[PDB]
Amino acid sequence: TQDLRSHLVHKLVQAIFPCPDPCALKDRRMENLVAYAKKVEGDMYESANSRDEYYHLLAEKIYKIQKELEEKSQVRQNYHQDAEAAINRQINLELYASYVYLSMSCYFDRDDVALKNFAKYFLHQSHEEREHAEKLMKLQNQRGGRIFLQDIKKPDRDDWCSGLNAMESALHLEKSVNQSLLELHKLATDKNDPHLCDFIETYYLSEQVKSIKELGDHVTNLRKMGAPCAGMAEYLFDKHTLG
């Protein structure tokens, strides 16, 4: 339990205060800050019961300390924390979709698949999702909202079966992205945010609808021709549609 306590006491000095400055200021301020942090953590440890409640109280104290040192942006005008959380969730979903599309592109360009056009299409879709995520991040930075990048989840299905299952998974992912965008629009409308919801419904929903329609057409073609019931249909759809 020594390494855990060391990590917990070394992460709080960075979570409370960002980075000092030797040349601009002095050095005694960071020392006083870390001394006060050690004092308060010792006082919380001496007045604790178990292990989880102490960690919860320490996290609450860190949050309360960060409540003051925020430094809001001067460009922030009419923006709620719920909208920020929704934008963060949308960014996480976009990153997950880009990761899934990259995995699909890297799964079809192998030797046991031999579908270069499918890999190129999946790579183009991943690039489009990456550009959309970057545009969302830039729009959030222009409004003044903070961006907290977290971990990116991995696809639950490493083996995408064949082509029809991959197309169905992509269609379900696009439907989930559309539902998330609709929820974001509803939250922005309920929280007085016409600019963000209008930009989302104008420069994002159209591409989502087009992608959903294209994936539906691809699924219909794979079901009518015969995939994955026959390798001829996949080859013909590779050499004709995406070719």
Binding site: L4, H7, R51, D52, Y55, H56, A59, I62, Y63, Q81, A85, N88, F148, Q150
Partner: peptide
């Protein structure tokens, strides 16, 4: 309190790190 997502983030981090 729980008004910001960093609440749930730090809660999940502490639940995953500490047994």
């Amino acid at each position: 309190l729980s008004r910001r997502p960093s609440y749930r983030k730090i809660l999940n981090d502490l639940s995953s790190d500490a047994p």
